[PDB]
Ligand binder design. Structure first.
Ligand SMILES: COc1ccc(C2=N[C@@H](c3ccc(Cl)cc3)[C@@H](c3ccc(Cl)cc3)N2C(=O)N2CCNC(=O)C2)c(OC(C)C)c1
Ligand SMILES: [Cl-]
Length: 92
């Protein structure tokens, strides 16, 4: 592959369940794809605050079970990446 910065990942089963609900089923995804799909899952389910759309409340949604937090701001990039990595493996 041309892009040295790309990340290929294999989601854990429950992350795969989430991704399949919003997107295509694949063996391997890229990290940028996973980020995009997670955001669109949030949009599709309206997990954000309508009057503060950069805040997400996900407790007891599948997303909250995966991330292990009840809520987060989309500005919290370290948190979002680290939680995502806790839900997949990077491909060798
Ligand atoms: C002012 O309101 C905003 C501002 C930015 C984001 C956002 N920001 C993008 C983003 C966030 C964090 C990282 Cl680490 C990377 C990208 C991306 C995203 C990706 C993954 C997750 Cl878990 C959540 C959001 N993401 C989005 O998914 N957005 C923005 C672009 N188009 C959309 O339809 C939704 C946003 O997300 C909602 C889904 C809550 C809302
Ligand atoms: Cl994105």
């Amino acid at each position: 592959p041309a892009s040295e910065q790309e990340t290929l990942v294999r989601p854990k089963p429950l992350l795969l369940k989430l991704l399949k609900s919003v997107g295509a089923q694949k063996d391997t995804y890229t990290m940028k794809e996973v980020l995009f799909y997670l955001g669109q899952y949030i949009m599709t389910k309206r997990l954000y605050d309508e009057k503060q759309q950069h805040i997400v409340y996900c407790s007891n949604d599948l997303l909250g079970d995966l991330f292990g937090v009840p809520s987060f701001s989309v500005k919290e990039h370290r948190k979002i990446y680290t939680m995502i990595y806790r839900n997949l493996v990077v491909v060798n």
